[PDB]
Design a protein around this ligand. Structure first.
Ligand code: HEC
Ligand code: NA
Length: 64
């Protein structure tokens, strides 16, 4: 259901951080992403429903 991260990034992140292929958040970390949602960085708190498995999948595709 989770895909490989590409759909999750496109649906939840690309509007603010760019298409995955040219994302400004390449090389991010799970700790940065969880902290950004939890701290509402840039208004990101609405993403608090994403699970650890979903956030990690997004981190991993940004590492490729
Ligand atoms: C617009 C409503 C955004 C959504 C959707 C996403 N991000 Fe975001 N994020 C946004 C801003 C304005 C900021 C602060 C400025 C900055 O770009 O740093 C952030 C912050 C982050 C961070 C923390 C900063 C860092 O360590 O680089 C991360 C890790 C981050 N954003 C990642 C990220 C992810 C993975 C998103 C989809 C789940 C996502 N953001 C969505 C604006 C918006
Ligand atoms: Na806000």
């Amino acid at each position: 259901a989770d895909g490989d991260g590409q759909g999750l990034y496109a649906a939840n992140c690309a509007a603010c951080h760019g298409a995955l292929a040219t994302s400004e958040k390449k090389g991010t970390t799970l700790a940065r992403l969880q902290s950004a949602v939890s701290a509402n960085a840039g208004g990101m708190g609405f993403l608090s429903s994403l699970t650890s498995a979903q956030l990690q999948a997004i981190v991993d595709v940004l590492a490729v």
